[PDB]
């Protein structure tokens, strides 16, 4: 069963206890940060469900450590290129709120590309340049502050390879691993998040991930997109690896 193997590899459960998932995940963040000796975390907050869930979990993790007598801080940054993000910040309530506007770095790069090359960066290619500029901003803040960069990647986002390689894919740790989009909505409700924040088909993708009976149409499409994106789920390939064969 390819569905069983994928389900296994991405760490998806068929059923979850949301309260215990919140606990398990906050504990992972605490634990990783005490192990490494880092000062806390930094995460880009966009207004979307994922970064909202991931940011609230990081504020809870940082607060528990300070309660045990340690030093930890959480920096939430807004990364615009020139309302829900603000709603997300009122809910998360981070220790610090920053902002870094990526419009001038992206422009400078575009102009240079045309100047040097003789071509315009296509929408799709400039789209990835923005995702990668935001990575650099998060790593520059973490670098300056002694913090770890959180990633908002999860299962439904992992099966489809739906993220920019080294853009939002470039992170130090990932608290939402193994969760589906629907399971991620459950946690948010448990956390008492405003509904506006958590509200083939994505719900179809969650069904397959949760081991539910799906249509071969969907199954086959999913299993091919997966093998097609394995490279984004591994470290750069060498002749000593086999997954790409």
Chain contacts with ligand DND (rule: CB under 6 A): 36, 127-128, 131, 139, 142-143, 148-149, 162-165, 167-168, 172, 231, 237
Q: Is 53 exposed, middle or buried (0-12, 13-18, 19+ CB in 10 A)?
A: buried
Contact 208, 223 (CB under 8 A): no
Give CA–CA dist 199/118, Å, rounded.
Answer: 43
Which residue numbers belong to the known binding site for Mg(2+)? 50, 157
The one of ligand DND, a second copy, none whose footprint includes residue 83, by CB under 5 to 8 A per kind, is: none
Give CA–CA dist 167/217, Å, rounded.
Answer: 31
Contact 81, 109 (CB under 8 A): no
Q: Is 244 in the site for a second copy (CB under 8 A)?
A: yes
Can you tell me which residue has the tokens 């206890």?
17
**Which lies closer to ligand DND via its Cβ, residue 211 or residue 218?**
218
Give CA–CA dist 4/2, Å, rounded.
Answer: 5
**Which lies closer to ligand DND via its Cβ, residue 20 or residue 238?**
238
Give CA–CA dist 178/184, Å, rounded.
Answer: 10
Q: Catalytic residue among 21, 50, 153, 210, which? A: 50
157 catalytic per annotation: yes
Q: Which of 163, 190, 195 is nearest to 56 (CA)?
A: 190
* DSSP code, position 176: B
Q: Catalytic residue among 21, 153, 157, 210, which? A: 157
Which residue numbers belong to the known binding site for deamido-NAD(+)? 32, 132, 165, 172, 231-232
The one of a second copy, ligand DND, none whose footprint includes residue 163, by CB under 5 to 8 A per kind, is: ligand DND
Q: Is 39 in the site for a second copy (CB under 8 A)?
A: no
Interacting positions 84-123 with a second copy (CB under 8 A): 98-102, 104-105, 107-109, 111-113, 116-117, 119, 121-122
Q: Is 162 exposed, middle or buried (0-12, 13-18, 19+ CB in 10 A)?
A: middle
Binding site for a second copy (CB under 8 A): 11, 24-25, 28, 32, 35-36, 98-102, 104-105, 107-109, 111-113, 116-117, 119, 121-122, 124-125, 128-129, 132-133, 135-137, 139-141, 143-144, 151, 153, 165-166, 170-175, 177-178, 231, 233-240, 244-245
């Amino acid at each position: 069963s390819m569905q069983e193997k994928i389900m296994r590899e991405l760490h998806v459960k068929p059923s979850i206890d949301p309260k215990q998932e919140i606990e398990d995940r906050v504990n992972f963040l605490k634990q990783y940060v005490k192990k490494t000796g880092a000062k806390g975390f930094v995460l880009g907050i966009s207004g979307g469900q994922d970064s909202t869930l991931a940011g609230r979990l990081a504020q809870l993790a940082v607060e528990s450590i300070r309660e045990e007598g340690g030093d930890a801080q959480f920096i939430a940054v807004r990364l615009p290129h020139g309302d829900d993000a603000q709603l997300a910040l009122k809910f998360i309530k981070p220790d610090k709120s920053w902002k870094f506007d990526i419009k001038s770095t992206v422009s400078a790069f575009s102009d240079q590309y045309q100047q040097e090359t003789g071509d315009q960066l296509t929408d799709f290619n400039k789209g990835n340049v923005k995702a990668r500029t935001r990575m650099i901003a998060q790593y520059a803040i973490g670098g300056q502050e002694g913090l770890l960069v959180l990633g908002t990647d999860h299962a439904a986002e992992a099966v489809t390879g739906f993220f920019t390689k080294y853009g939002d894919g470039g992170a130090d740790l990932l608290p939402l691993t193994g969760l589906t989009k629907r399971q991620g909505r459950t946690l948010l409700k448990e956390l008492g998040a405003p509904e506006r924040l958590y509200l083939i088909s994505y719900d179809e993708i969650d069904d397959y991930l949760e081991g539910k009976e799906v249509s071969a149409k969907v199954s086959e499409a999913l299993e091919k997109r997966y093998s097609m994106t394995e490279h984004k789920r591994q470290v750069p390939a060498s002749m000593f690896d086999d997954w790409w064969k």
